[PDB]
Swiss-Prot record, chains B, C:
Job description of the protein: Forms the portal vertex of the capsid. This portal plays critical roles in head assembly, genome packaging, neck/tail attachment, and genome ejection. The portal protein multimerizes as a single ring-shaped homododecamer arranged around a central channel.
Binding partners and assembly: Homododecamer.
Compartment(s) where it occurs, according to its Swiss-Prot or TrEMBL record: Virion
UniProt name for this protein: Probable portal protein
Length: 51, 51, 51
């Protein structure tokens, strides 16, 4: 995460750590990526659900 | 690359609503910074890309 | 690589419960540091990877 303006530096640092933490612990990063590419390559398009 | 950016933007908006202040403080041992709720429509202050 | 990381996280949680203070002191000749029991659900402060 990179800030857009000079006053957004604090926000970028806070969100980047939180966002990386969730994928590191709450999700299987390796398995998700493997299904991510293979779904797009085989079916021609990939659909991701966010909840 | 853009597919992950789309997911990242949605999660950041969710993190600003469904996460309490103390939860972010524990994850990031820094001072908490808030964002206006009506400003979540536009990602004015953040940019998301893969590392 | 992730398979070993999954094993490492589980053992660290077990080490914080099933190991007494003096056992850690003998293994690591340093001051003992404790972790809150309810905080073991999230690996907020540790990252595990192969060397």
């Amino acid at each position: 995460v990179t800030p857009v303006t000079w006053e957004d530096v604090q926000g970028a640092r806070q969100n980047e750590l939180v966002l990386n933490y969730q994928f590191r612990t709450k999700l299987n990063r390796v398995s998700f990526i493997d299904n991510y590419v293979r779904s797009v390559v085989d079916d021609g398009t990939g659909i991701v659900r966010v909840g | 690359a853009k597919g992950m950016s789309e997911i990242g933007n949605k999660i950041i908006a969710m993190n600003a609503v469904f996460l309490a202040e103390h939860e972010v403080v524990r994850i990031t041992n820094e001072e908490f910074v808030t964002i206006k709720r009506e400003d979540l429509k536009g990602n004015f202050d953040l940019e998301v890309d893969i590392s």
